[PDB]
Symmetry: C2
Subunit: 246 residues, 2 copies
């Protein structure tokens, strides 16, 4: 049994007014004892969000760089994230890979550094539509997962998030069975490439479309251990998703 994990990625949305209201709503929510909840605010608001959020909810940064301090204008380090009271960082998000061209190697180095500095890591992988239709879903997600694994010595504070990028605004959508299919393959890769123990214990969360209407069936899939939620994470709907297994 792996502990249910629900992360909310606020992306680049919100201001203090709107996010304060959202945080009020989340603070009022009775968070299930068996569910681990994490919110990832825009970078300018990590501090603000951590101050306002009840400690029952953890805060994540949406990205970080790979050294503790340096001449990297516009970046932040795991040390700063921890200093702001956040305990997680999202790494390798599809938007960072594809819009900002972050390489597997760079993401791997970020993972190693974030873990070494005491953060938990939500490490994201996922294939694009062209890749899925060319039939290389496995080649792609396995290679992304491998580079992440090459940089994980301890999987205790790692959560893998599968993003079906092929279903983001493409005209295709993933069924719960298709999500389950990839999650199972990913877990199989962990078994065959790392260990049975790591495969059994590592949360693989779903980063596809999830809403109040769909969260229950997705959460029931045997290899789906939770969610990295997009737009719904900014709405009272997020609470329904937190309640997915209740």
């Amino acid at each position: 049994s792996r502990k249910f994990f629900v992360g909310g990625n606020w992306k680049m949305n919100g201001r203090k007014q709107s996010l304060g209201e959202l945080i009020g709503t989340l603070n009022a929510a009775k968070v299930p004892a068996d569910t681990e909840v994490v919110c990832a605010p825009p970078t300018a608001y990590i501090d603000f969000a951590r101050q306002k959020l009840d400690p029952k909810i953890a805060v994540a940064a949406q990205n970080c760089y790979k050294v503790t301090d340096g001449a990297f204008t516009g970046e932040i380090s795991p040390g700063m994230i921890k200093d702001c009271g956040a305990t997680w960082v999202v790494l390798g998000h599809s938007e960072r890979r594809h819009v900002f061209g972050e390489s597997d190697e760079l993401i791997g180095q970020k993972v190693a550094h974030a873990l070494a500095e005491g953060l938990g890591v939500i490490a994201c992988i996922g294939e694009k539509l062209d890749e899925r239709e060319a039939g290389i879903t496995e080649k792609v997600v396995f290679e992304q997962t491998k580079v992440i694994a090459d940089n994980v010595k301890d999987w205790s504070k790692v959560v893998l998030a599968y993003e079906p990028v092929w279903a983001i605004g493409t005209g295709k959508t993933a069924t719960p069975q298709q999500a389950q299919e990839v999650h199972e393959k990913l877990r199989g890769w962990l078994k065959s490439n790392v260990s049975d123990a790591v495969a059994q214990s590592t949360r693989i969360i779903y980063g596809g479309s999830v809403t109040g209407a769909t969260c229950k069936e997705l959460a029931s899939q045997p290899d789906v251990d939770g969610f990295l939620v997009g737009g719904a994470s900014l709405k009272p709907e997020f609470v329904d998703i937190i309640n997915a297994k209740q």
Copy 2:
């Protein structure tokens, strides 16, 4: 007369404690009249710094993206920057261009968006060593400045910062005469391609190595209107540089 402008780019350095100390020292400093001082904290600390800094000192973000909200995990918008009480953003910094591969096109789009949203912009340009040695300093900085300028509709909100990347961490050093040479070329470019008014009124600040021992000679150069200070901005030496015209 152009108002002397001193910016401190903290880059990816510091934590609440050390930055709190830096801020205390800055608050206690006597800033000369007619000197505009701006500090650019790491993104996680924009909010923190603005809360702690005397209102006499403005806060800048070190980067932003080109739309107001959106699916850009890890980015922030001019709207968020303003919401945290900051009034400037640094754009096109050498580290953004050369470590994170930000294109001129992207930088131009960011400048346009930040200005449309009512932020001030510190727009950075500068040539690398291989460019300097190839004798194409003017070609490079002129092309960078052109993209910036094509995306400016009100120069009263812009400061241009020349970074001699060729001298920074290469082992080469820039003299006051070399800085002045480039600044005069840039002002002449503004005069020829934008207007006489804009050339006369626009601050062009020097973003190369500056110490307490070099700042007065640099600030005495006719076309040098201040500094974008790097590492020294974290130290008491910054106050000396603020007083370069004194």
